[PDB]
Symmetry: D2
Subunit: 190 residues, 4 copies
């Protein structure tokens, strides 16, 4: 029954209007659902992992730097969590069940110790939230699948810039990864 909720890249740079790689409106639209579900997961005794892009300026060795403009730079406000989710972190970030995790690839597992931390705790299910549905959420989900985790996707708490991409990703999660789609109350959606 040991579960972990993963909060992926829900920062000012991905969500806010002035954000450097902002998803804009669709990302902002999930603010209430993402904060509610994360607070709920925490209330249920789940582990919470904030897995956040930590980029550097002039990282010529990173293939991502040629693909997107500078975003989520180390030591910038762009890395601040957006909305009430940010308030949640300031309140509960010191709790032994809440984690902040820097990542450099899209997937929350790549080059991090997420798998190690989950295995230490004998977690068998990950609950995915954040942005973008078809990039960092999708990559994290695929890695989770290959690492043998059960997957839940919080449908109203994931978002993409592109609606067709969001739809592809949701279908992929359900039909290919065998993931459970859930709402903000963590109830399965049929």
């Amino acid at each position: 029954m040991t579960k972990a909720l993963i909060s992926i890249d829900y920062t000012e740079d991905f969500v806010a209007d002035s954000g450097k790689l902002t998803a804009g409106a669709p990302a902002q639209a999930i603010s209430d659902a993402i904060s509610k579900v994360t607070r709920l997961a925490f209330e249920r005794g789940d582990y919470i992992f904030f897995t956040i892009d930590a980029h550097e300026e002039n990282d010529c060795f990173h293939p991502e730097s040629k693909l997107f403009p500078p975003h989520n730079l180390i030591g910038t406000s762009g890395r601040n969590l957006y909305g009430d989710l940010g308030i949640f972190y300031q309140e509960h970030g010191s709790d032994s069940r809440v984690f902040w995790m820097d990542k450099r690839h899209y997937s929350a597992f790549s080059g991090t110790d997420l798998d190690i931390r989950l295995r230490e705790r004998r977690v068998s299910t990950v609950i995915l939230t954040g942005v973008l549905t078809d990039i960092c959420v999708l990559h994290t989900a695929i890695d989770a699948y290959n690492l043998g985790y059960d997957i839940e996707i919080v449908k109203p708490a994931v978002a993409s810039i592109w609606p067709e991409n969001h739809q592809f990703a949701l279908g992929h999660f359900k039909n290919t990864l065998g993931a459970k789609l859930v709402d903000e109350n963590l109830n399965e959606l049929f």
Copy 2:
């Protein structure tokens, strides 16, 4: 020197009576997939056939798709001229057959090890399906620091909108180069 990965282009995925057939669009790439494989082989590239090998109540994929590519069945035989190429050159030191259980060609296999032994920097992806075993393989390759090439006329999906999502993902997110059956970049 690069490596061409041939993903799941078997009877069960391609033939009209295949257990998990992609049908017409998978059949449509037969000429292109075999042309580009022979071409890559001609110019000294390594060839990795990464093929579903299914049996298995502990595999989560059992719930998601009907039995396909079962061991010892003709369903695992490579489709078309690609099977002919393997019959001719499967024993060449640069050609490989790898059994896999997940979608990604890297998951639970020694693909990364074999590529690293040969100091390969670039993988060229062919096969089916674009949005499942090709997409998963591409993403694993990206995370493992490989340069990626996708042979656009040698990948196929059941649904054209999924094939289009995957192609866009390769270019815009993974930084892959889309190439034609002559291994020339597309513009």
Copy 3:
């Protein structure tokens, strides 16, 4: 309560007197204990993974370090002693696996971790040869992958007693492994 026992390279080439990479007397001495403990684990309901060297290869760094051994399709890959009989009896059981490997570690380039995770196995029990090479590498990989570890002391062996002793110390003190006897009871 269900665990996995890993049976590492206990084959003719590593054990038999004419073996291509034979560990000789100390490897032969564990034959009774390794078969006893494997049968006990299987009877208990545990999963059994035979993780066996499958060699061919100028590209393999190991080819320069050891003479040819456990070559694919040769008798050097046959399991040694009563262990071979257990495999004849139960090799087709859904709980028993034969796994080819190219590195020393049973995890490296294999699907061992995946198979264990499918089954929610939290504890691996290690047996076989050599204590300081394929058992050590496998133990280290298991540790980094968050498995609890048991080492069957009378069912592991090395060519050199000092290497065998180093490895056993490393398992207990660094990896936090439980050392057990052939009855799967902890040793004190």
Copy 4:
């Protein structure tokens, strides 16, 4: 270009008053480890400091039962010992120098080391630090499985137990096919 890995050469592992000190043998390599690191840097190599980062009362870490508290985040225990420390003050902000926190013994486990190396097409890793038979050994084995050529700087690795140091060196040479080199990065025969 190669990468030199500097493993756990900190106060807690080296200094007389270190919480998990290897003592005199670890102190004895201070000159060699600092010399070889400055040399690798001069030669244009990448330098990775891979340093234990433990927390007090981490009940979920299996290492917590095995050793007393050591290299705690925000303590002096994590300070690089000797001239290596001075080198880090001098060049830590350089593009080729990296500081990597680790929780397991191996420098690769749960880190982005492999990712950073492959971004640079590094094919050979040069290993230094402590302990020879624990964080150096684990790092070497991980490097081997990941297909890296390995160099071990013999006078720049140390263990608390000399027999364990001897086992590890033999293992590197005979099992991993590593090249043993001196503080001048010249092969030892």
